[PDB]
mmCIF file of C-alpha atoms (C1' of nucleotides) in Angstrom:
data_model
loop_
_atom_site.group_PDB
_atom_site.id
_atom_site.type_symbol
_atom_site.label_atom_id
_atom_site.label_comp_id
_atom_site.label_asym_id
_atom_site.label_seq_id
_atom_site.Cartn_x
_atom_site.Cartn_y
_atom_site.Cartn_z
ATOM 1 C CA UNK B 1 13.873 -14.086 -25.066
ATOM 2 C CA UNK B 2 10.476 -15.693 -24.527
ATOM 3 C CA UNK B 3 9.736 -15.060 -28.205
ATOM 4 C CA UNK B 4 12.814 -16.966 -29.366
ATOM 5 C CA UNK B 5 12.386 -19.775 -26.852
ATOM 6 C CA UNK B 6 8.869 -19.999 -28.275
ATOM 7 C CA UNK B 7 10.259 -20.843 -31.728
ATOM 8 C CA UNK B 8 12.893 -23.227 -30.376
ATOM 9 C CA UNK B 9 9.782 -24.711 -28.780
ATOM 10 C CA UNK B 10 7.934 -24.680 -32.114
ATOM 11 C CA UNK B 11 10.458 -27.047 -33.675
ATOM 12 C CA UNK B 12 9.291 -29.697 -31.208
ATOM 13 C CA UNK B 13 5.828 -29.026 -32.594
ATOM 14 C CA UNK B 14 7.411 -29.700 -35.993
ATOM 15 C CA UNK B 15 8.941 -33.106 -35.269
ATOM 16 C CA UNK B 16 5.605 -34.205 -33.803
ATOM 17 C CA UNK B 17 3.940 -36.635 -36.174
ATOM 18 C CA UNK B 18 0.326 -37.405 -37.140
ATOM 19 C CA UNK B 19 -1.459 -39.351 -34.365
ATOM 20 C CA UNK B 20 -4.060 -40.191 -36.990
ATOM 21 C CA UNK B 21 -7.649 -39.005 -36.394
ATOM 22 C CA UNK B 22 -10.749 -41.197 -36.264
ATOM 23 C CA UNK B 23 -12.945 -40.051 -39.182
ATOM 24 C CA UNK B 24 -11.397 -38.217 -42.128
ATOM 25 C CA UNK B 25 -13.459 -35.301 -43.422
ATOM 26 C CA UNK B 26 -14.017 -34.867 -47.144
ATOM 27 C CA UNK B 27 -15.358 -32.245 -49.528
ATOM 28 C CA UNK B 28 -15.817 -32.367 -53.292
ATOM 29 C CA UNK B 29 -15.821 -29.273 -55.498
ATOM 30 C CA UNK B 30 -16.359 -29.094 -59.243
ATOM 31 C CA UNK B 31 -15.717 -26.288 -61.718
ATOM 32 C CA UNK B 32 -15.981 -25.336 -65.377
ATOM 33 C CA UNK B 33 -12.566 -23.677 -65.855
ATOM 34 C CA UNK B 34 -9.314 -23.822 -63.859
ATOM 35 C CA UNK B 35 -7.263 -21.823 -66.394
ATOM 36 C CA UNK B 36 -6.768 -18.866 -64.061
ATOM 37 C CA UNK B 37 -3.096 -19.143 -63.010
ATOM 38 C CA UNK B 38 -3.390 -17.546 -59.559
ATOM 39 C CA UNK B 39 -6.210 -19.922 -58.623
ATOM 40 C CA UNK B 40 -3.988 -22.817 -59.686
ATOM 41 C CA UNK B 41 -1.241 -21.419 -57.449
ATOM 42 C CA UNK B 42 -3.468 -20.913 -54.412
ATOM 43 C CA UNK B 43 -4.978 -24.390 -54.620
ATOM 44 C CA UNK B 44 -1.450 -25.847 -54.462
ATOM 45 C CA UNK B 45 -0.168 -23.564 -51.689
ATOM 46 C CA UNK B 46 -3.175 -23.816 -49.376
ATOM 47 C CA UNK B 47 -3.194 -27.574 -49.913
ATOM 48 C CA UNK B 48 0.429 -27.881 -48.817
ATOM 49 C CA UNK B 49 -0.028 -25.488 -45.885
ATOM 50 C CA UNK B 50 -3.056 -27.062 -44.175
ATOM 51 C CA UNK B 51 -1.811 -30.624 -44.752
ATOM 52 C CA UNK B 52 -5.009 -31.338 -46.677
ATOM 53 C "C1'" G E 1 -18.284 36.564 75.911
ATOM 54 C "C1'" U E 2 -15.238 38.619 70.125
ATOM 55 C "C1'" U E 3 -15.199 42.138 66.647
ATOM 56 C "C1'" C E 4 -17.371 46.149 63.011
ATOM 57 C "C1'" G E 5 -21.012 50.543 62.956
ATOM 58 C "C1'" C E 6 -24.343 54.693 64.939
ATOM 59 C "C1'" G E 7 -26.163 58.056 69.558
ATOM 60 C "C1'" A E 8 -24.761 60.124 75.009
ATOM 61 C "C1'" A E 9 -21.009 61.601 78.999
ATOM 62 C "C1'" A E 10 -15.909 62.821 81.411
ATOM 63 C "C1'" U E 11 -11.236 65.669 78.478
ATOM 64 C "C1'" U E 12 -8.296 69.024 73.179
ATOM 65 C "C1'" U E 13 -14.128 67.458 67.052
ATOM 66 C "C1'" U E 14 -10.875 61.888 64.884
ATOM 67 C "C1'" A E 15 -8.600 58.970 69.994
ATOM 68 C "C1'" C E 16 -9.492 56.024 75.072
ATOM 69 C "C1'" U E 17 -13.255 54.453 78.747
ATOM 70 C "C1'" U E 18 -18.200 53.596 79.985
ATOM 71 C "C1'" C E 19 -23.691 53.300 78.828
ATOM 72 C "C1'" G E 20 -28.200 52.806 74.622
ATOM 73 C "C1'" U E 21 -28.063 50.218 70.184
ATOM 74 C "C1'" G E 22 -27.771 46.971 64.049
ATOM 75 C "C1'" G E 23 -25.246 42.755 62.051
ATOM 76 C "C1'" A E 24 -21.539 39.216 61.810
ATOM 77 C "C1'" C E 25 -20.304 35.375 65.323
ATOM 78 C "C1'" A E 26 -18.362 26.333 63.999
ATOM 79 C "C1'" U E 27 -14.576 22.204 63.745
ATOM 80 C "C1'" U E 28 -12.533 18.569 60.683
ATOM 81 C "C1'" U E 29 -12.254 15.188 55.876
ATOM 82 C "C1'" G E 30 -11.873 14.602 50.741
ATOM 83 C "C1'" G E 31 -3.769 17.153 51.279
ATOM 84 C "C1'" U E 32 0.535 10.305 51.456
ATOM 85 C "C1'" C E 33 5.708 11.565 45.215
ATOM 86 C "C1'" A E 34 6.901 6.765 43.343
ATOM 87 C "C1'" A E 35 12.013 4.028 43.409
ATOM 88 C "C1'" U E 36 16.079 2.223 47.083
ATOM 89 C "C1'" U E 37 19.220 1.155 52.681
ATOM 90 C "C1'" U E 38 20.894 -7.253 57.309
ATOM 91 C "C1'" G E 39 16.507 -6.317 61.946
ATOM 92 C "C1'" A E 40 14.150 -4.655 68.794
ATOM 93 C "C1'" A E 41 11.287 0.547 64.643
ATOM 94 C "C1'" A E 42 11.537 5.908 63.345
ATOM 95 C "C1'" C E 43 10.951 9.295 58.505
ATOM 96 C "C1'" A E 44 16.456 9.635 58.649
ATOM 97 C "C1'" A E 45 19.301 9.272 54.284
ATOM 98 C "C1'" U E 46 19.516 8.154 48.375
ATOM 99 C "C1'" A E 47 17.606 9.552 44.050
ATOM 100 C "C1'" C E 48 13.891 14.060 42.506
ATOM 101 C "C1'" A E 49 9.261 13.500 38.467
ATOM 102 C "C1'" G E 50 14.680 14.626 32.430
ATOM 103 C "C1'" A E 51 10.439 8.395 36.374
ATOM 104 C "C1'" A E 52 13.828 11.281 19.753
ATOM 105 C "C1'" U E 53 12.483 14.054 14.952
ATOM 106 C "C1'" C E 54 12.296 14.784 8.843
ATOM 107 C "C1'" A E 55 12.436 11.887 4.186
ATOM 108 C "C1'" G E 56 12.551 7.694 0.268
ATOM 109 C "C1'" C E 57 11.237 2.980 -2.119
ATOM 110 C "C1'" A E 58 8.822 -1.230 -2.349
ATOM 111 C "C1'" G E 59 4.593 -4.422 -1.211
ATOM 112 C "C1'" U E 60 -1.444 -5.896 -1.179
ATOM 113 C "C1'" U E 61 -6.499 -4.123 -4.170
ATOM 114 C "C1'" C E 62 -8.737 -2.366 -8.594
ATOM 115 C "C1'" C E 63 -8.324 0.591 -13.681
ATOM 116 C "C1'" C E 64 -6.055 2.109 -18.315
ATOM 117 C "C1'" C E 65 -2.033 2.007 -22.013
ATOM 118 C "C1'" U E 66 1.742 -0.958 -24.517
ATOM 119 C "C1'" G E 67 4.492 -5.504 -25.329
ATOM 120 C "C1'" C E 68 5.622 -11.140 -25.516
ATOM 121 C "C1'" A E 69 3.676 -16.046 -24.385
ATOM 122 C "C1'" U E 70 -0.477 -19.448 -24.601
ATOM 123 C "C1'" A E 71 -5.241 -21.401 -25.603
ATOM 124 C "C1'" A E 72 -9.040 -21.101 -28.907
ATOM 125 C "C1'" G E 73 -11.137 -18.443 -33.095
ATOM 126 C "C1'" G E 74 -11.224 -15.661 -37.689
ATOM 127 C "C1'" A E 75 -9.690 -12.107 -42.670
ATOM 128 C "C1'" U E 76 -6.383 -11.574 -46.736
ATOM 129 C "C1'" G E 77 -2.265 -11.902 -50.004
ATOM 130 C "C1'" A E 78 1.791 -14.810 -52.390
ATOM 131 C "C1'" A E 79 2.132 -17.105 -60.767
ATOM 132 C "C1'" C E 80 2.236 -22.070 -63.420
ATOM 133 C "C1'" C E 81 0.542 -28.138 -62.761
ATOM 134 C "C1'" G E 82 4.330 -35.107 -58.721
ATOM 135 C "C1'" U E 83 2.005 -42.500 -60.362
ATOM 136 C "C1'" C E 84 13.783 -42.793 -57.232
ATOM 137 C "C1'" A E 85 19.715 -43.232 -57.479
ATOM 138 C "C1'" A E 86 23.896 -46.845 -59.059
ATOM 139 C "C1'" A E 87 25.726 -51.526 -61.188
ATOM 140 C "C1'" G E 88 25.034 -56.268 -63.789
ATOM 141 C "C1'" A E 89 22.466 -59.987 -67.401
ATOM 142 C "C1'" G E 90 19.107 -60.726 -71.547
ATOM 143 C "C1'" A E 91 15.775 -58.772 -76.215
ATOM 144 C "C1'" U E 92 14.807 -54.780 -80.710
ATOM 145 C "C1'" U E 93 16.317 -50.540 -83.945
ATOM 146 C "C1'" U E 94 20.275 -46.871 -86.188
ATOM 147 C "C1'" G E 95 25.692 -33.520 -103.078
ATOM 148 C "C1'" U E 96 23.249 -27.779 -101.091
ATOM 149 C "C1'" U E 97 19.510 -23.451 -95.962
ATOM 150 C "C1'" U E 98 20.012 -24.943 -88.762
ATOM 151 C "C1'" U E 99 26.615 -25.935 -86.659
#
RNA sequence: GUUCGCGAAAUUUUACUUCGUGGACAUUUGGUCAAUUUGAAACAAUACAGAAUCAGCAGUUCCCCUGCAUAAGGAUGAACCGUCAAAGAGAUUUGUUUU
């Protein structure tokens, strides 16, 4: 019961929005070849997951 | 003066009676049942020391095991890639192998 109420509580963590930070943090990477398909998949996934 | 013991006499050895002899030879206290009875104050009633035991759970304090929550923190896997929708008006082009 506490486990399910936790998820019904998680949805309120979903509809919470931004509250923009102060300083954005940036990194720059550079590569010779992106052709590897799984790398191309992971860079998309992990970008969507972390809200990067 | 009281008793116990030994020796002598009068009678039937122990016994009574008397002489010579060795001890022992104080009284009290520390001894109240408590409780209850309308009277010039006594111990007379009225009781009468009879004036509960086995077992179960839980709760505080620490420890371990296993869950779920929460705060932080990490490790890894997931094949395919992003600068609109509708309607209206104007401008340009368009004989035989795969229908």
